[PDB]
Design a protein around this ligand. Structure first.
Ligand code: FMN
Ligand code: FMN
Lengths: 200, 200
């Protein structure tokens, strides 16, 4: 009974306490397959995910996340990383299958030229930005399936790269702890609509 | 009959041709109120939205977006901008209402200190990243309500800032054209799950 998207967005709160029940791999795969349909500029999809269930690795990530207890307690921690260089080395995988021959090359050169003119920090920030569209899809879908989650930026990226063996060029836009909820979550407010939106 | 979140994510395609029917302001406000419940680091919510319906302004934005015709043809264009300095000047609006007295100050100083040590480009990229979580929520909700959309980065940000009178420090993570669909949209692929996800 997956929830409608409006109820999911209005009811979500971050959850930091979880039941001890495992999350079935079949259920996780259905959620990730739907979240990976998120759109990105030029269909580049620079996002990459590590699903961490091993207890020793979760304990190591808890230390990298300044001791946040939910990293170790949740049944599953997702590491969302962005690898622009892996995307650019495999551009034929993201170009539309109908766009072939000479059209494919012109699209591929325009993309390579745009990124050849950018530094390492700018590339990481661009690929991280696109990865946050996928994060928005994933948080709404986790709520719609009845799972709780907390996205995190409070961690040392150098330690996370070392524990998992990630490339030095990768950016890590978030860790996400998830599982079946054992708490309601705290009420949080948002700015009034009229403070954020201007009508023209 | 808002769609369930899984069907919305799996069926969405970008739409670039629209009917001439207007989008009622009451319907737009319900969608934006649900999308503005997206989460952000420290609840900072650095996103700001301009709803553009004026025909002359849409024509000016079409030129700024290198002539993309859907900017002028859609009934509504949303301009998503990020203003980190406006968020930091009003930190009392985002701090939890129960966190008062001395606790409020310690939270506010930690936030101000983190951003005082960053340059203008880094601040814009950080606020743009958080704004893409809201973009993910908004694209899924527009599909769930039966509207079509296309998010865009193909535009000159200096021209958009001038047309709307935005601050020089603002980043513009996307323009979004939307309306009732007049086309099915093109089929697009995503990478295989096993290419993007590693199980540990
Ligand atoms: C990108 C990002 C990073 C965040 N980092 C942390 C974190 O490191 N630890 C934590 O407990 N919550 C963290 N949060 C949770 C946010 O504080 C929270 O989403 C926000 O206060 C609104 O609360 P809600 O998610 O309950 O609606 C983060 C959220 C996002 C979107
Ligand atoms: C941040 C962003 C910027 C994009 N910019 C443009 C644009 O300037 N013009 C356009 O026609 N489509 C643009 N697109 C649409 C993308 O090409 C498209 O989302 C992707 O090819 C997958 O197609 P789908 O959205 O139909 O699933 C953009 C998408 C995103 C997410």
């Amino acid at each position: 009974p997956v929830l409608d998207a409006k109820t999911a967005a209005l009811k979500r709160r971050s959850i930091r306490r979880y039941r001890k029940d495992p999350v079935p791999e079949g259920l996780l795969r259905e959620i990730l397959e739907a979240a990976l349909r998120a759109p990105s500029a030029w269909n580049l999809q620079p996002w990459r995910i590590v699903v961490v269930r091993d207890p020793a690795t979760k304990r190591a990530l808890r230390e990298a996340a300044f001791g946040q207890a939910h990293v170790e307690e949740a049944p599953v921690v997702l590491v969302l990383y962005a690898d622009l260089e892996d995307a650019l080395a495999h551009l034929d995988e993201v170009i539309h299958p109908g766009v072939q021959g000479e059209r494919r090359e012109a699209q591929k050169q325009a993309i390579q030229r745009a990124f050849a003119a950018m530094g390492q920090e700018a590339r990481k920030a661009w690929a991280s930005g696109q990865s946050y569209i996928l994060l928005g899809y994933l948080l709404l879908l986790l709520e719609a399936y009845g799972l709780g989650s907390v996205p995190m930026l409070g961690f040392d990226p150098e330690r996370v790269r070392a524990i998992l063996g990630l490339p030095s060029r990768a950016a890590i836009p978030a860790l996400v702890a998830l599982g079946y909820p054992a708490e309601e979550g705290y009420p949080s407010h948002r700015l009034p609509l009229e403070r954020v939106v201007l009508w023209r």
